[PDB]
Design an enzyme around this catalytic site. Structure first.
Site, PDB file in Angstrom:
ATOM      1  N   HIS A  18       0.865  -1.188   0.000  1.00  0.00           N
ATOM      2  CA  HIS A  18       0.000   0.000   0.000  1.00  0.00           C
ATOM      3  C   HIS A  18       0.892   1.226   0.000  1.00  0.00           C
ATOM      4  CE1 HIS A  18      -2.400   3.297   1.366  1.00  0.00           C
ATOM      5  NE2 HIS A  18      -3.442   2.655   0.863  1.00  0.00           N
ATOM      6  N   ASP A  20       1.024   4.211   1.301  1.00  0.00           N
ATOM      7  CA  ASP A  20       1.351   4.871   2.590  1.00  0.00           C
ATOM      8  C   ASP A  20       2.397   4.020   3.312  1.00  0.00           C
ATOM      9  OD1 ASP A  20      -0.291   7.107   2.294  1.00  0.00           O
ATOM     10  OD2 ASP A  20      -2.038   6.146   3.280  1.00  0.00           O
ATOM     11  N   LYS A  21       2.246   2.696   3.250  1.00  0.00           N
ATOM     12  CA  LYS A  21       3.176   1.777   3.939  1.00  0.00           C
ATOM     13  C   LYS A  21       4.505   1.693   3.208  1.00  0.00           C
ATOM     14  CE  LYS A  21       1.493   1.007   7.809  1.00  0.00           C
ATOM     15  NZ  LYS A  21       2.739   1.654   8.296  1.00  0.00           N
ATOM     16  N   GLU A  46      10.830  12.016   5.808  1.00  0.00           N
ATOM     17  CA  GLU A  46       9.452  11.791   5.301  1.00  0.00           C
ATOM     18  C   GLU A  46       9.522  11.302   3.872  1.00  0.00           C
ATOM     19  OE1 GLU A  46       7.490  11.850   7.608  1.00  0.00           O
ATOM     20  OE2 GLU A  46       7.950  13.552   8.912  1.00  0.00           O
ATOM     21  N   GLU A  59      15.298  15.999   7.576  1.00  0.00           N
ATOM     22  CA  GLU A  59      16.564  16.426   8.247  1.00  0.00           C
ATOM     23  C   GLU A  59      17.229  15.198   8.890  1.00  0.00           C
ATOM     24  OE1 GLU A  59      16.374  20.426   6.701  1.00  0.00           O
ATOM     25  OE2 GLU A  59      18.102  19.673   7.990  1.00  0.00           O
ATOM     26  N   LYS A 161      -5.306  -4.452   0.967  1.00  0.00           N
ATOM     27  CA  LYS A 161      -5.878  -3.887   2.213  1.00  0.00           C
ATOM     28  C   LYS A 161      -6.780  -4.939   2.863  1.00  0.00           C
ATOM     29  CE  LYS A 161      -6.999   0.491   2.283  1.00  0.00           C
ATOM     30  NZ  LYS A 161      -7.546   1.838   2.002  1.00  0.00           N
ATOM     31  N   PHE A 231      -8.203  -5.361  -9.738  1.00  0.00           N
ATOM     32  CA  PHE A 231      -7.185  -4.529  -9.051  1.00  0.00           C
ATOM     33  C   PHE A 231      -5.843  -4.910  -9.678  1.00  0.00           C
ATOM     34  CE2 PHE A 231      -5.727  -3.164  -4.472  1.00  0.00           C
ATOM     35  CZ  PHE A 231      -4.858  -2.257  -5.027  1.00  0.00           C
ATOM     36  N   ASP A 239      -2.625   6.690  -6.672  1.00  0.00           N
ATOM     37  CA  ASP A 239      -2.882   6.660  -5.207  1.00  0.00           C
ATOM     38  C   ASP A 239      -1.624   7.141  -4.479  1.00  0.00           C
ATOM     39  OD1 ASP A 239      -3.859   6.306  -2.661  1.00  0.00           O
ATOM     40  OD2 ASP A 239      -3.780   4.112  -2.710  1.00  0.00           O
ATOM     41  N   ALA A 240      -1.457   8.455  -4.360  1.00  0.00           N
ATOM     42  CA  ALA A 240      -0.254   9.009  -3.711  1.00  0.00           C
ATOM     43  C   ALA A 240      -0.109   8.460  -2.291  1.00  0.00           C
ATOM     44  CB  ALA A 240      -0.301  10.515  -3.712  1.00  0.00           C
ATOM     45  N   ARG A 245       0.679   8.277   7.399  1.00  0.00           N
ATOM     46  CA  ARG A 245      -0.743   8.383   6.974  1.00  0.00           C
ATOM     47  C   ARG A 245      -1.491   7.087   7.322  1.00  0.00           C
ATOM     48  NH1 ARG A 245      -2.185  12.633   3.440  1.00  0.00           N
ATOM     49  NH2 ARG A 245      -4.131  11.442   3.300  1.00  0.00           N
ATOM     50  N   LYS A 246      -0.880   6.214   8.124  1.00  0.00           N
ATOM     51  CA  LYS A 246      -1.535   4.957   8.581  1.00  0.00           C
ATOM     52  C   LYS A 246      -1.224   4.789  10.072  1.00  0.00           C
ATOM     53  CE  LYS A 246      -3.584   3.172   4.851  1.00  0.00           C
ATOM     54  NZ  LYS A 246      -3.826   4.561   4.397  1.00  0.00           N
ATOM     55  N   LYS A 266      11.420   8.660  12.208  1.00  0.00           N
ATOM     56  CA  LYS A 266      11.837   9.398  13.426  1.00  0.00           C
ATOM     57  C   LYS A 266      12.772   8.542  14.279  1.00  0.00           C
ATOM     58  CE  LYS A 266       7.656  12.296  14.002  1.00  0.00           C
ATOM     59  NZ  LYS A 266       6.823  11.736  12.915  1.00  0.00           N
ATOM     60  N   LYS A 270      12.613  11.220  19.349  1.00  0.00           N
ATOM     61  CA  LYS A 270      11.299  11.857  19.079  1.00  0.00           C
ATOM     62  C   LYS A 270      10.236  11.215  19.973  1.00  0.00           C
ATOM     63  CE  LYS A 270      13.140  13.931  15.300  1.00  0.00           C
ATOM     64  NZ  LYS A 270      14.557  13.505  15.363  1.00  0.00           N
ATOM     65  N   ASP A 272       7.164  11.443  19.945  1.00  0.00           N
ATOM     66  CA  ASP A 272       6.042  10.929  19.114  1.00  0.00           C
ATOM     67  C   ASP A 272       6.162   9.408  18.981  1.00  0.00           C
ATOM     68  OD1 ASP A 272       4.483  13.187  18.619  1.00  0.00           O
ATOM     69  OD2 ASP A 272       5.505  13.680  16.740  1.00  0.00           O
TER      70      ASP A 272
END
Ligand code: NA
Ligand code: NA
Ligand code: NA
Ligand code: NA
Lengths: 389, 389, 389, 389
Positions: A18, A20-21, A46, A59, A161, A231, A239-240, A245-246, A266, A270, A272
């Site tokens: 996918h 995003d992954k 990123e 960075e 998915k 598919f 599909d950018a 985003r997951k 990260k 971090k 997060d």
């Protein structure tokens, strides 16, 4: 009297294919490559993918030398994007890098690098201490990738998915598997009809037995495979994808609350990522210590301050030993050092263990040895609460 | 006996100048510009910013003609990024576009364009039906931007973040404001000392009165302003931004659960946005109808199917009129059409109203007129439940 | 009888701040940084600049480790692009890299890496063996940059262009300086009127004396300074730049023919650069040996072959000692080894000497020590031709 | 006495599939699409290609609406880049656009938009008034593309290059074809051996007859086909391309001098293109009027001035009618208006005729109807010189 409906709760997973992954995986492959040569690497990387393009931004502060383009291309070939025919090709796609590389005593007293809130969660409903819906969805996504890579089911492509809906009782507890959805990219040689038979047997039924949930999979269950039809083309084209985003698939599938922070790209400095891992560690130990059946802990931080500004323990009335969540929280404050540098030290986070986390969940991974999954604070928690060991 | 700790719950907001919010705002400015000329525009637009660069990617199907670069540059100047001295300049920065533009009866029966889960939430603890921590954080971020734009506090720059921690009781209810954090970018002519006095009076104290929470802001409260020190350079330089990386700030600050879907850059045909808006509409009406004090509703969908595969109503034991969450859910199923095309029609979503949502929250906006905030289904819900009006 | 017009011949130069020259300079700064650590580096690096963006693309095979982004940013600050106010800022601009890093005996027998033709030229009309029009244009561009960097003329900015038109006689020889054009970027504090007086005295008149051409600068000469008016914004913004878009400025200003090959971004293994340098070496030695006043030599190569497929000596009827161009060419074939590996060896090209070539011309540089400028084959040429030494 | 060598002069062409020509073609496809809807479009569009990426940059001022990405993708499919297997795919590659769209009386008096020099050339040695070496190279490149597109020679791919070396006499005139080089990309199903037989018969021998040069192709000629071996992968992958990097192939193959200006991506308001076209028009008319066998004319301009600062006519001692180049130049100044706006008007340049020029040469195109190829000023030139018509 007034009619009752059955409450139906859903969680989803995706394959490593996918878009995003793909981004999360590339971000964490870059981070591992840097931590392998320089465990102190500061990394905020990123990834963005779209038709024919992989764009890496952010960075790095490091003493390591890594070839980012070859890391990107090799990771795409490992996922299976190796042809224009499949919609994306690690060997012939664009790769662009826009990363800036420049411009224990004190250690444990270093400030959080940012403000923010992070949540951790644990439940005894599964051996891996994970909510059933997300655990089943991850098992299905992993099995979908496995059947393709091991050739159990042929003509499959990387993008896919999974979604699982479970009926719940009035006590907020899972009662029955209701609906399973699997959408997979595939070769033109196969169709939805062939996939319906192959995936229901080699993926859904196999996972139901492998997970020992046959008792929740009895009766009538809706199975939808490629409900939208063909598919053939998948991945970034049409599909950018972007890193982070997951975040719900990466955590507890929506069963637990989230602070919004993404993990991939990260380094452990971090909060997060580190504080979310610490909260999973605290929650799992709370449940493993018999203090509750389910536990969710939020932690919060101010930039330039080492001590959390907030902590919030919730056990949803599953608290045990006549202890309140306020009492469990006081025991958490006695047992756990939640300063960023203390979390890195106690969990030994300065190692290249992150690429494995970047698909199929950061939590409840039976297939990995992750330090935030250790139930090694049970004795300390019960002692602090003056309970028998 | 065993000591009690005070549970402390935190939510954060950011200014329109935080790099993630720059992306959300640019994504939604592009979407509005397209919906203004072609209300049927299909839009999946992602934005990425890093040092000196704005990269817009994704897919559009539209009959509209819009100049994306000028939309980007004008939006950056509106936020205040107008100089290399401030770290980013809408007039001189890079702008790159990688968007593919190609390759009621049936209407209400159209399938979901994707699978996924989405959550909505509402509480009567505030007039805007929003959790107190996120509401205060949004008020602080909005006030921080206002004092700069109206010149109430001079020498401020666009990038900023706000965080609010509230003490809670054993019943999971807010009791007292404990800690407020404000970090703002600024000119070299001012320092943390000057900001500490200016922001505490013109932003924190002003918001406490404007929100009528003086009764929760009595006593001792920790105020931290620029705790990390100087913040002269901000925006994308040294802090990459991406669309959909502030989904908790966009929703309920972590008080409510989330399905992972981002809203900005997506037209109303995307259930990730429309279904989340519908769930806010359902939750607010449930509380406005006196069926509960707090309500969280999850909805889920299979790709190619119009009817949700899941729905899950939770009122956290605040249910009223002796009704269960199962009974409230049956009334929601009688009152609300939750097919994607029905949500677009009933909420009139095909209008350029989205850029305003892209900073300071999608929900509980007193300053906007958003259709998912309408309590226009109260009579229908009470009727369906055979209650007095 | 039929009226005669005066033939007027023109050549131009640009400053290191012209966007095309920014690209050539960045390309050759990357090449030097790689040759400094690994003299065998294979380098095909192209640079593109536009508003707020520097995009570096191509292929490297090297054992060296260099930080391309910092090399880009430092080179832009050295040229003077250090502010959004000047139109471009090395510290805050975008930098993107899309470079692929992967996928004496035999040495002197290696094939050309490509086909192609390359020209070299030399004239005794100047001490540096360069055509007068291009030599004056380069002196003017260098002086324009010098007056700014040394502060001789204040309020100047990096972007600038120079053009010189000379009247010629019926024998194709320069007779008089006719027109000089200088266009320079500048601060808003100065205007064309101030620049007209400052540049005509500190740049044009100073260069005329420094070059000892007062005898060609007598009489009436048209001087145009900023004839288009204000030039406050310059560099990439509103004027995209690319590597290899100033090949005539890099060579002989149009006086000599060209094969089309660009030099910057290419290691010495590329005949486009090495063979052009060899042809300058051959031409200069032909004139220094007294075989001609002006000489132009073309060389050509087939991919996978070491020996040139072509060679073409032209002296424009300035041939001396009663020798034909055919005879001079036979002597060139006896004296010079023009196989690619022989050129690298004899000129010692595997050194970081290229960034200096990337503005103000590759040829006739009195300020540099370049091996293709050596007149060290004069004795060999006269000997081969059985002339007195 | 001293030995004589044979002077050998070389020119090259490339297919529309060579990466530099892909860029020129995409630049000019964008320009045509804009001139088709708005003949006044100002266009400065540069293209860059590398592995999997097409990056378009520069500036447009237009009232037209064109979809640049679809123009790029369709042009790549037309050239034949339609698969990862061929090394590049118009359907799945990256496409990024960084173009800024914002920020007869007087008409004929408008200033040049830039300074610069431009050359034009013509010779009666061919019917198309073109030097023999470049004309043969263009015929070979066009035939190579034709045999692939029409299927005369199968298994060929788009990328290719051609080079022709001709022996010359002591009078600088072509005497014999000496060496022909053809390098073409191909399928793995074919090898150099198969290509050697196919191309020598269907491309080289066919062109020799089609061009009627059998009299120069008698005797011993070296033919090299794929001398470097296999050429399966071609296009941008491993060979970055940029607009304006084949200016000699676009003009006269090095036989004529060049000012450095590229043509593709520029509207007719750019003297770099319009003035070069005007010089070809002047040179061809000079030779067609019987004033010379070969003619090269340089023109130069100052920014903000309509009248050229320079003009320079050279006929290389082939001048006729006892006229000097000074006299021919005076007649050119009487007959031709060389102000930029006059060139646009007299040649009717505001039409979408440029994409056809972007491969196989701008000059001597028998297959196109280009206005700068018209010999419609012969009568005017002879009249001005008081010669019989
Ligand atoms: Na409940
Ligand atoms: Na509770
Ligand atoms: Na002459
Ligand atoms: Na000659």
């Amino acid at each position: 009297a007034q009619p009752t409906a059955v409450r139906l709760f859903t969680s989803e997973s995706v394959t490593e294919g996918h878009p995003d992954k793909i981004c999360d995986a590339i971000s964490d492959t870059i981070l591992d490559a840097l931590l392998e040569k320089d465990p102190q690497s500061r990394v905020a990387v990123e990834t963005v993918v779209t038709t024919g393009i992989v764009h890496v931004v952010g960075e790095v502060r490091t003493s390591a030398y890594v070839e980012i383009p070859q890391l990107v291309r090799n990771k795409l070939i490992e996922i299976g994007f190796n042809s224009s025919e499949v919609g994306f090709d690690g060997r012939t796609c664009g790769v662009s890098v826009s990363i800036g590389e420049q411009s224990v005593e004190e250690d444990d007293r270093a400030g959080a690098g940012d403000q923010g809130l992070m949540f951790g969660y644990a439940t005894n409903e599964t051996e891996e201490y994970m909510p059933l819906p997300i655990a089943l969805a991850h098992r299905l996504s992993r099995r979908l990738t496995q059947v393709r890579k091991e050739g159990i089911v042929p003509h499959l492509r990387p993008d896919g998915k999974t979604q699982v809906t479970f009926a719940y009782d009035a006590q907020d507890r899972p009662s029955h598997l209701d609906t399973v959805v699997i959408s997979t990219q595939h070769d033109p040689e196969v169709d939805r009809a062939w996939l319906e038979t192959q995936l229901r047997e080699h993926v859904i039924d196999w996972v139901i037995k492998d997970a020992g949930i046959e008792d929740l999979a009895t009766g009538e269950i809706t199975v939808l495979i490629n409900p939208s039809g063909s598919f053939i083309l998948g991945g970034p084209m049409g599909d950018a994808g972007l890193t982070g985003r997951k975040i719900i698939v990466d955590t507890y599938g929506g069963m637990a609350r989230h602070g919004g922070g993404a993990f991939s790209g990260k380094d452990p400095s971090k909060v997060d990522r580190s504080a979310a891992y610490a909260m999973r560690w605290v929650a799992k130990n709370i449940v493993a210590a018999g203090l509750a059946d389910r536990a969710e802990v939020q932690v919060a931080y101010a930039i330039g301050r080492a001590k959390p500004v907030g902590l919030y323990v919730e056990t949803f009335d599953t608290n045990k030993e006549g202890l309140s969540d306020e009492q469990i929280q006081a025991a958490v404050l006695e047992v756990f050092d939640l300063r960023p540098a203390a979390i890195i030290r106690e969990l030994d986070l300065l190692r290249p263990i992150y690429a494995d986390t970047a698909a199929y969940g950061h939590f409840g991974r039976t297939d990995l040895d992750l330090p935030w999954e250790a139930i090694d604070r049970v004795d300390e928690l019960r002692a602090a609460l003056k309970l028998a060991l």
